Enzyme design. Structure first.
Site, PDB file in Angstrom:
ATOM      1  N   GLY A 157      10.854  37.237   4.733  1.00 37.69           N
ATOM      2  CA  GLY A 157      12.038  36.291   5.153  1.00 37.69           C
ATOM      3  C   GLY A 157      13.465  36.997   5.504  1.00 37.69           C
ATOM      4  O   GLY A 157      14.490  36.644   5.818  1.00 37.69           O
ATOM      5  N   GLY A 160      13.622  38.622   8.721  1.00 34.65           N
ATOM      6  CA  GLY A 160      14.159  38.440   9.824  1.00 34.65           C
ATOM      7  C   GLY A 160      13.692  39.496  10.811  1.00 34.65           C
ATOM      8  O   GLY A 160      14.265  39.725  12.007  1.00 34.65           O
ATOM      9  N   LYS A 161      12.838  40.149  10.321  1.00 36.21           N
ATOM     10  CA  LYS A 161      12.404  41.534  11.266  1.00 36.21           C
ATOM     11  C   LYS A 161      11.670  41.075  12.506  1.00 36.21           C
ATOM     12  O   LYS A 161      12.001  41.814  13.697  1.00 36.21           O
ATOM     13  CB  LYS A 161      11.407  42.463  10.330  1.00 36.21           C
ATOM     14  CG  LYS A 161      10.890  43.697  11.272  1.00 36.21           C
ATOM     15  CD  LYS A 161      10.103  44.718  10.077  1.00 36.21           C
ATOM     16  CE  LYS A 161       9.151  43.935   9.315  1.00 36.21           C
ATOM     17  NZ  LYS A 161       8.118  43.295  10.070  1.00 36.21           N
ATOM     18  N   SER A 162      10.912  40.207  12.474  1.00 36.65           N
ATOM     19  CA  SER A 162      10.124  39.699  13.859  1.00 36.65           C
ATOM     20  C   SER A 162      10.866  39.118  14.737  1.00 36.65           C
ATOM     21  O   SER A 162      10.868  39.666  16.061  1.00 36.65           O
ATOM     22  CB  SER A 162       9.044  38.892  13.397  1.00 36.65           C
ATOM     23  OG  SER A 162       8.181  38.487  14.488  1.00 36.65           O
ATOM     24  N   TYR A 163      11.884  38.555  14.606  1.00 32.43           N
ATOM     25  CA  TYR A 163      12.966  38.117  15.571  1.00 32.43           C
ATOM     26  C   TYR A 163      13.687  39.094  16.207  1.00 32.43           C
ATOM     27  O   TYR A 163      13.548  38.919  17.483  1.00 32.43           O
ATOM     28  CB  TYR A 163      13.994  36.943  14.930  1.00 32.43           C
ATOM     29  CG  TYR A 163      15.128  36.455  15.581  1.00 32.43           C
ATOM     30  CD1 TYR A 163      14.724  35.318  16.368  1.00 32.43           C
ATOM     31  CD2 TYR A 163      16.191  37.011  15.814  1.00 32.43           C
ATOM     32  CE1 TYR A 163      15.738  34.651  17.062  1.00 32.43           C
ATOM     33  CE2 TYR A 163      17.016  36.464  16.730  1.00 32.43           C
ATOM     34  CZ  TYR A 163      16.798  35.225  17.521  1.00 32.43           C
ATOM     35  OH  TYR A 163      17.773  35.002  18.448  1.00 32.43           O
ATOM     36  N   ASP A 196       6.099  49.172  13.058  1.00 33.14           N
ATOM     37  CA  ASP A 196       6.302  48.159  12.268  1.00 33.14           C
ATOM     38  C   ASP A 196       6.029  48.589  10.781  1.00 33.14           C
ATOM     39  O   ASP A 196       4.753  48.858  10.489  1.00 33.14           O
ATOM     40  CB  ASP A 196       5.536  46.913  12.462  1.00 33.14           C
ATOM     41  CG  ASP A 196       5.640  45.662  11.648  1.00 33.14           C
ATOM     42  OD1 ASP A 196       6.398  45.963  10.638  1.00 33.14           O
ATOM     43  OD2 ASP A 196       5.153  44.788  12.008  1.00 33.14           O
ATOM     44  N   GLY A 201       7.238  46.752   4.045  1.00 33.04           N
ATOM     45  CA  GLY A 201       8.484  46.849   3.193  1.00 33.04           C
ATOM     46  C   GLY A 201       8.097  47.476   1.651  1.00 33.04           C
ATOM     47  O   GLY A 201       6.781  47.110   1.418  1.00 33.04           O
TER      48      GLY A 201
HETATM   49  N1  LIG Z   1      20.308  36.909  15.219  1.00 32.48           N
HETATM   50  C1  LIG Z   1      19.357  35.655  15.000  1.00 32.48           C
HETATM   51  N2  LIG Z   1      19.677  34.598  15.441  1.00 32.48           N
HETATM   52  C2  LIG Z   1      19.061  33.547  14.958  1.00 32.48           C
HETATM   53  N3  LIG Z   1      17.876  33.496  14.348  1.00 32.48           N
HETATM   54  C3  LIG Z   1      17.633  34.781  13.670  1.00 32.48           C
HETATM   55  C4  LIG Z   1      18.329  36.157  14.045  1.00 32.48           C
HETATM   56  N4  LIG Z   1      17.729  36.774  13.475  1.00 32.48           N
HETATM   57  C5  LIG Z   1      16.901  36.245  12.627  1.00 32.48           C
HETATM   58  N5  LIG Z   1      16.563  34.995  12.800  1.00 32.48           N
HETATM   59  C6  LIG Z   1      15.594  34.168  12.231  1.00 32.48           C
HETATM   60  O1  LIG Z   1      14.922  35.053  11.525  1.00 32.48           O
HETATM   61  C7  LIG Z   1      13.581  34.463  11.582  1.00 32.48           C
HETATM   62  C8  LIG Z   1      12.403  35.686  12.010  1.00 32.48           C
HETATM   63  O2  LIG Z   1      12.128  36.151  10.484  1.00 32.48           O
HETATM   64  P1  LIG Z   1      10.805  35.498   9.917  1.00 32.48           P
HETATM   65  O3  LIG Z   1       9.675  35.451  10.749  1.00 32.48           O
HETATM   66  O4  LIG Z   1      11.267  34.099   9.454  1.00 32.48           O
HETATM   67  O5  LIG Z   1      10.568  36.187   8.498  1.00 32.48           O
HETATM   68  P2  LIG Z   1       9.335  37.478   8.066  1.00 32.48           P
HETATM   69  O6  LIG Z   1       8.173  36.780   8.947  1.00 32.48           O
HETATM   70  O7  LIG Z   1       9.262  37.558   6.684  1.00 32.48           O
HETATM   71  N6  LIG Z   1      10.274  38.559   9.028  1.00 32.48           N
HETATM   72  P3  LIG Z   1       8.930  39.808   9.180  1.00 32.48           P
HETATM   73  O8  LIG Z   1       9.411  41.187   8.348  1.00 32.48           O
HETATM   74  O9  LIG Z   1       8.841  40.198  10.583  1.00 32.48           O
HETATM   75  O10 LIG Z   1       7.658  39.383   8.710  1.00 32.48           O
HETATM   76  C9  LIG Z   1      13.394  33.427  12.678  1.00 32.48           C
HETATM   77  O11 LIG Z   1      13.324  32.269  11.909  1.00 32.48           O
HETATM   78  C10 LIG Z   1      14.660  33.507  13.496  1.00 32.48           C
HETATM   79  O12 LIG Z   1      15.129  32.462  14.120  1.00 32.48           O
END
Ligand SMILES: Nc1ncnc2c1ncn2[C@@H]1O[C@H](COP(=O)(O)OP(=O)(O)NP(=O)(O)O)[C@@H](O)[C@H]1O
Ligand SMILES: CC(=O)O[C@H]1C(=O)[C@@]2(C)[C@H]([C@H](OC(=O)c3ccccc3)[C@]3(O)C[C@H](OC(=O)[C@H](O)[C@@H](NC(=O)c4ccccc4)c4ccccc4)C(C)=C1C3(C)C)[C@]1(OC(C)=O)CO[C@@H]1C[C@@H]2O
Ligand SMILES: Nc1nc2c(ncn2[C@@H]2O[C@H](COP(=O)(O)OP(=O)(O)OP(=O)(O)O)[C@@H](O)[C@H]2O)c(=O)[nH]1
Ligand SMILES: Nc1nc2c(ncn2[C@@H]2O[C@H](COP(=O)(O)OP(=O)(O)O)[C@@H](O)[C@H]2O)c(=O)[nH]1
Ligand SMILES: [Mg+2]
Lengths: 451, 433, 388
Positions: free
Chosen positions: C99, C101-104, C247, C250
């Site tokens: 949650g 936002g690493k992937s983004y 990658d 965590g």
């Molecule tokens: N600067 C930004 N602007 C817009 N959306 C963002 C930004 N940074 C992050 N996000 C959002 O962050 C989300 C990416 O993280 P998300 O894939 O939802 O969580 P996660 O999968 O738990 N992260 P991860 O560690 O990679 O697995 C997406 O919904 C993006 O839209």
């Protein structure tokens, strides 16, 4: 029915419990096998005091105690010893390895699958009780089980029971001597739990007890039996007020009401005055004034800290034996006129006094003389901060290089937890430095309107 | 109930194991036939640490004997305690390694490792709660080093969360019995440093020095050296088997001793040690044991502690004694010899006390040091290694068994890295920039 | 040579579930400082941390102090590509919990108006390469993708059985992995397709926190070889550089996931690897700063590369003449407080610097103090000139 439930955790807890239960059995006339011949010879009485012992129909007396450990050894020594028939067979000992001087191993990894059984048996003991007063938890800082499992148990108890008092007797690490290389990590980790979830923590130091044994009792080569017996005497003095009659009785709630100014300052020191050998029991009067003065001597303190470097915030004196109020009042008045003993200006009264008629008992094979009078002093002061600060330094010297850390992270912790605990400790230390400060000069700065 | 599996590979391992099973079977009263004829009731309380129970009220040890040559096994069976062991645990083959590490690791030992692992798995699955493993072997040999390292690797692959001790007899400067000791020692240390929780350092010169100067034996033999080794192995695990005032499991020793994962090479020692006629002239007290434990002439690894700094030390006392004396003695040793103890550990002395001493003594003590001086040992081997590797002195005997020249470079680099950390913590400050 | 590190911490503006709920923010950013407040203990104080870069991507349509994607790329990726084209190694760690936002930040969306780091890196790499293809110049790019699970290496692209590969140490080329497939690529589309193919092969398991949580570190390595024909036959490889895209899984507490067996083993190994990576990164930055300023050569110290496979394989990229930057994502809810603070504590490593508190003016007390000071100044001016 002023009932108390004792919990002993770890090796130090179990051994102190052995000493404590020997003393309790001897005080009440109970034999090692649980029978009390005094009632049979007399025909009936109140000697089966419900504070510690529960009476069955057949006349046996089962103690209200709970032993816990992760090593089978320490409690297998009890299951086959002198007191094998006194305790209930259920002793809550995990047939596995030990926490291995590891907080993480005893809190996260192995402390589970033994916690549920412990709380179930504590629930069973608490259901038998009417008017339960509190818990008395014996454990040791610096150990794996005694730190981590005590943390988990205290957290669960605070969740479940809530309002009942939880007093804590614990062995703080000494300044110089130690029995493990990773004591500071465990102590700093468990401070974060004992600060929040306990109500009053009494700390004792083994270097102080060795010095007392060397100087007073003339024992050149003491073992842990002597220290455990002294601690047993202190706990008996604390709990005597709700087992025997007296001129002034002090329950466990009066303790917390009088000795704890603020919720985060509940770390008082404890001392026992007439610690003397049989030979030196002669050539001495052992009056009330002498023992009251001896309580305030820095050499007799049970934690390696000088009260002269701090200020007294509260004192509670519990007397036993042929004691009368007027001598206690005279002794308190004499102490109040000494300049070396400083009280915080925001506590003009200072002293709580309790008196009990029952004199202390002598354990056969012991080293304390038979006396007519005794006093146990408990003092909430600011010198205790010194005893913490040293430990903090030690912690830093290992955490700058992250020594011995991978053992902790391998058992279910992360690094940041360490930092969190350290920060909490600093806050607690800061609080002491803020409460011993004299009130600002003419606290309302100054004043003097018209007329 | 904590329970440990014992493995012994090679000639040195088998001899030390036989002597060890006689020392542990005389503290826990066991007849050579396997029956119990002890006196105290605490001997049987924790017998399951080392022994399985057999139907006729008999006791069979968990030993697993390995060797690529059958002859040593015969010397164990035709002995005082030969019949104590289970016949199925005598796993062996023929056409021994011939002091070739490659044959022990790759060619010959690979065929017998499956049988050895079958026996080990059978022995471990019956245990109530496995504490760990022990292995006795020699680094400077053939089947010993190679098969021991291979078995260690396989076992750590199968049982990652269990302790793996190791009592290894390494080469020595002057007393050398093989010409290819450096290669075997190097390639063994390359494996031990990665896949072992504790390693104990023994070499025959230190044991000979103890026999000549302390015990004053005129003509020591291998039996006496194995006797001293067995004494220390029994001392290490005393707290799993007996009660005491302050216990110390193997895991407690591992946690308190090693500060970082790769520094788990220890210097063992035993006290007291007197020479018959001198016995009446020395009073046995805790100060005397502490004095003898920390003496440089008593160490079993031929590494002078005065050339380095103790990262950690552990002392396991046996006997009825006062805790004040133990604490004050360890504190005094730390304070007086402040230059020989590292400064960023506030207190680097573990202490444990067990109530029941050995049979014929009133008090005893075992010492486990972890010091930077051990680097010297590895450095010596490294020197000899390069002295033979620059010219490829005997390299074809190894490459003829499916090896490559790069593996030697990996082993040498790994040992040199290991020496680095020790040399580092070895200085006595770091201020200038 | 020197390998100075950078620390950047981003925030992820709310998601659909968190917008639907009435959750509140807890993270605030100003300058190089971030501050977080405990929802359960609003009375005590905020906790403050400081990094090289703090990115406030919380308000998407904001015009003032919005951490744009191109800003982040200009900050880290362009500099690292320029360092790579000079013939040196660069690395980028992606850290954060579920949650966050690493992937983004690492990849970004496919609308191509707000891209992540990696597509921008690949596009600039290929654009530069196609730009400077003169008669004498030639470039080769190949890619590898592996994972580390419980201190065992596995290949993500190869469809073989997921066995444990063996790690070796070539005397000159350093550590490497046997039988690790190396594939050549000609455009960023191939790189991203291979990334998808390997990401489908990761070891992902369901915890008490999320149904799909990474359980193993991953490394995408881009090897970049330059061959220039100076006038004669000089096509002999001038330089070879490495781009590491790592990658990290965590950190976690056993309280959050009390599952026994495989989960505990995975958590313990991940935490050990992360602690060792923190130690090696901190050791690398210190000597760095030191020399860069002391120009002295305090021997070569000793950076613990061998206490883990992850740092062992990345020895050439972490150390030597290199560049490094770890990006951390910090979710914005009030429910994930226990997550977010921990992430900051991990980002506080790598040259932990003084943060200073965030004390500011109280409006009423500010106005009172300023008016009192103004009264004093005007009164002093009047008295000095004899007008009072
Ligand atoms: N600067 C930004 N602007 C817009 N959306 C963002 C930004 N940074 C992050 N996000 C959002 O962050 C989300 C990416 O993280 P998300 O894939 O939802 O969580 P996660 O999968 O738990 N992260 P991860 O560690 O990679 O697995 C997406 O919904 C993006 O839209
Ligand atoms: C009359 C008397 O005091 O006898 C002692 C004795 O003289 C001394 C010299 C013993 C003797 O030891 C030796 O002479 C010896 C020779 C070579 C190698 C090792 C030892 C003794 O053999 C050793 C023997 O030890 C035991 O009995 C322990 O149980 C011992 N077990 C064995 O040695 C043993 C060996 C083979 C088969 C069965 C038992 C032990 C020691 C440590 C840990 C576990 C067990 C003892 C007390 C003695 C003798 C018999 C003379 C000493 O040894 C030990 C290990 O205690 C030498 O230093 C001590 C000091 C003792 O005083
Ligand atoms: N006063 C006193 N202190 C003791 C006693 N036994 C142990 N200690 C202290 O306890 C500290 C070690 O912690 P332990 O109580 O042994 O921890 P533990 O109960 O063994 O738990 P584990 O470490 O997991 O085995 C030592 O520093 C001792 O000083 C005792 O009988 N009396
Ligand atoms: N302590 C001891 N060491 C031995 C014994 N036999 C051999 N050694 C040592 O081991 C080395 C020879 O190794 P070896 O036992 O042949 O290894 P193996 O062929 O695998 O059994 C020599 O350098 C000796 O120092 C013994 O009986 N006792
Ligand atoms: Mg214990």
């Amino acid at each position: 029915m002023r009932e108390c439930i004792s919990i002993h955790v770890g090796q130090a807890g179990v051994q102190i419990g052995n000493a404590c239960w020997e003393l309790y059995c001897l005080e009440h006339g109970i034999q090692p096998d649980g029978q009390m011949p005094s009632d049979k010879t007399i025909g009936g009485g109140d000697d089966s005091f419900n504070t510690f012992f529960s009476e069955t129909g057949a006349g046996k007396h089962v103690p209200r105690a709970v032993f816990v450990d992760l090593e089978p050894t320490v409690i297998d020594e009890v299951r086959t010893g002198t007191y094998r028939q006194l305790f209930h067979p259920e002793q809550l000992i995990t047939g596995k390895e030990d926490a291995a001087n590891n907080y993480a191993r005893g809190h996260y990894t192995i402390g589970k699958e033994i916690i549920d059984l412990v709380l179930d048996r504590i629930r069973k003991l608490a259901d038998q009780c009417t008017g339960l007063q509190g818990f008395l938890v014996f454990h040791s800082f610096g150990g794996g089980t005694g730190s981590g499992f005590t943390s988990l148990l205290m957290e669960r108890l605070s969740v479940d029971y809530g309002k009942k008092s939880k007093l804590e007797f614990s062995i703080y690490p000494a300044p110089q001597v130690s029995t493990a290389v990773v004591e500071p990590y465990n102590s700093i980790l468990t401070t974060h739990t004992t600060l929040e979830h306990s109500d009053c923590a009494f700390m004792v130091d083994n270097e102080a007890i060795y010095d007392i044994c060397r100087r007073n009792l003339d024992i050149e080569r003491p073992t842990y039996t002597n220290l455990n017996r002294l601690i047993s005497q202190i706990v008996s003095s604390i709990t005597a007020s709700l087992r025997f009659d007296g001129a002034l009785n002090v329950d466990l709630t009066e303790f917390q009401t009088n000795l704890v100014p603020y919720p985060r300052i509940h770390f008082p020191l404890a001392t026992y005055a007439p610690v003397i050998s049989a030979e030196k029991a002669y050539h001495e009067q052992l009056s009330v004034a002498e023992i009251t003065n001896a309580c305030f001597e820095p050499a007799n303190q049970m934690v390696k800290c000088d009260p002269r470097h701090g200020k007294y915030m509260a004192c509670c004196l519990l007397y036993r034996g042929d004691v009368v109020p007027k001598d206690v009042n005279a002794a308190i008045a004499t102490i109040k006129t000494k300049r070396s003993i400083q009280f915080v200006d925001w506590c003009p009264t200072g002293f709580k006094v309790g008196i009990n008629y029952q004199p202390p008992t002598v354990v056969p094979g012991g080293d304390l003389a038979k006396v007519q009078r005794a006093v146990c002093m408990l003092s909430n002061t600011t010198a205790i901060a010194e005893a913490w600060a040293r430990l903090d330094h030690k912690f830093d010297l290992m955490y700058a290089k992250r020594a011995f850390v991978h053992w902790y992270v391998g058992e279910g912790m992360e690094e940041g937890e360490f930092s969190e605990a350290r920060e909490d400790m600093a806050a607690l230390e800061k609080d002491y430095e803020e409460v011993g400060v004299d009130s600002v000069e003419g606290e309302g700065e100054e004043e003097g309107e018209e007329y | 109930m904590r329970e440990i599996v014992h493995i012994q590979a090679g000639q040195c391992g088998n001899q030390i194991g036989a002597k060890f099973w006689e020392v542990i079977s005389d503290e826990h009263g066991i007849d050579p036939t396997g029956s119990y004829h002890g006196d105290s009731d605490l001997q049987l309380e924790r017998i399951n640490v080392y022994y399985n129970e057999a139907t006729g009220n008999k006791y069979v040890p968990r030993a697993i004997l390995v060797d690529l040559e059958p002859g040593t096994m015969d010397s164990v069976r035709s002995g005082p305690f030969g019949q104590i062991f289970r016949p199925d645990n005598f796993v062996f083959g023929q056409s021994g390694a011939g002091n070739n590490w490659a044959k022990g690791h790759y060619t010959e030992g690979a065929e017998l490792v499956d049988s050895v692992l079958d026996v080990v798995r059978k022995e471990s699955e019956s245990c109530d709660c496995l504490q760990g493993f022990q292995l006795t072997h020699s680094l400077g040999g053939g089947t010993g080093s190679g098969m021991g390292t291979l078995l260690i690797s396989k076992i750590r692959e199968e049982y990652p969360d269990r302790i793996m001790n190791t009592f290894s007899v390494m080469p020595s400067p002057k007393v050398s019995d093989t010409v290819v000791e450096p290669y075997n020692a190097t390639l063994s240390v390359h494996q031990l440093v990665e896949n072992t929780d504790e390693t104990y350092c023994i070499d025959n010169e230190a044991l000979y020095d103890i026999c000549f100067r302390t015990l004053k034996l005129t003509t020591p033999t291998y039996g006496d050296l194995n006797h001293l080794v067995s004494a220390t192995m029994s001392g290490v695990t005393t707290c799993l088997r007996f009660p005491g005032q302050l216990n110390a499991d193997l895991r407690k020793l591992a946690v308190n001793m090693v500060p970082f994962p790769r520094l788990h090479f220890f210097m063992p020692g035993f006290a007291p040690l007197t020479s018959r006629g001198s016995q009446q002239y020395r009073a046995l007290t805790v100060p005397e044991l502490t004095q003898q434990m920390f003496d440089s002439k008593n160490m079993m690894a031929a590494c002078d502690p005065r050339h380095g700094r103790y990262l950690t030390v552990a002392a396991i006392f046996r006997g009825r004694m006062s805790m004040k004396e133990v604490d004050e003695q360890m504190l005094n040793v730390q304070n007086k010899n402040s230059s020989y103890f590292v400064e960023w550990i506030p207190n680097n002395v573990k202490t444990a006390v067990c109530d029941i001493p050995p049979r014929g003594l009133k008090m005893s003590a075992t010492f486990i040091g972890n010091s930077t001086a051990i680097q010297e040992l590895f450095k010596r081997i490294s020197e000899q290694f390069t002295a033979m590797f620059r010219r490829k002195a005997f390299l074809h005997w190894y490459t003829g068994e499916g090896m490559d020249e790069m593996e030697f470079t990996e082993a040498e680099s790994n040992m040199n890295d290991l020496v680095s950390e020790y040399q580092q913590y070895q200085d006595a400050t770091a201020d200038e920039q | 040579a020197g390998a100075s590190v950078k620390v950047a911490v981003r925030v992820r503006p709310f998601n659909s579930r968190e917008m639907s709920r009435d959750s509140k923010c807890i993270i605030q950013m100003s300058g190089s400082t971030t501050t977080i407040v405990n929802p359960k203990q609003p009375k005590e104080t905020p906790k403050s941390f400081s990094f090289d870069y703090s990115y406030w991507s919380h308000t998407s349509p904001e015009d003032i102090n919005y951490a744009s994607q191109k800003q982040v790329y200009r900050d880290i990726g362009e500099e690292m590509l320029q360092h790579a084209f000079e013939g040196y190694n660069v690395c980028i760690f992606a850290y954060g919990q579920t949650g966050a936002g690493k992937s983004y930040t690492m990849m970004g969306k496919q609308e191509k108006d707000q891209q992540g780091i990696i597509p921008q890196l690949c596009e600039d790499l290929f654009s530069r390469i196609n730009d400077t293809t003169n008669d004498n110049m030639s470039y080769s790019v190949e890619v590898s993708y592996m994972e580390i699970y419980c201190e065992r290496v596995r290949d993500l692209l190869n469809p073989k059985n997921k066995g444990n590969l063996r790690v070796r140490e070539h005397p000159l080329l350093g550590p490497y992995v046997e039988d690790l497939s190396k594939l050549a690529v000609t455009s960023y589309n191939d790189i991203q397709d291979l990334m998808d193919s390997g990401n489908k092969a990761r070891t992902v398991a369901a915890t008490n926190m999320n149904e799909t949580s990474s359980r193993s570190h991953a490394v995408f390595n881009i090897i970049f070889t330059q061959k220039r024909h100076d006038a004669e036959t000089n096509i002999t490889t001038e330089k070879v550089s490495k781009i590491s895209l790592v990658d990290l899984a965590g950190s976690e507490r056993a309280d959050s996931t009390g599952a026994k067996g495989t989960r505990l083993k995975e958590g313990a190994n991940i935490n050990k690897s992360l602690t060792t990576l923190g130690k090696v990164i901190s050791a690398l930055a210190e000597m760095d700063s030191g020399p860069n300023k002391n120009k002295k050569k305090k021997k070569t110290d000793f950076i613990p590369y061998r206490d883990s496979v992850l740092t062992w394989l990345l020895r050439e990229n972490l150390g030597g003449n290199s560049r490094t930057a770890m990006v951390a994502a910090l979710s914005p809810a009030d429910i994930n407080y226990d997550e977010t603070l921990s992430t900051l504590r991990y980002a506080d490593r790598a040259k932990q610097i003084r943060c200073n508190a965030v004390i500011n003016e109280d409006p009423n007390n500010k106005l009172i103090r300023e008016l009192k000071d103004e009264v004093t100044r005007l009164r002093d001016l009047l008295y000095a000139q004899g007008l009072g």
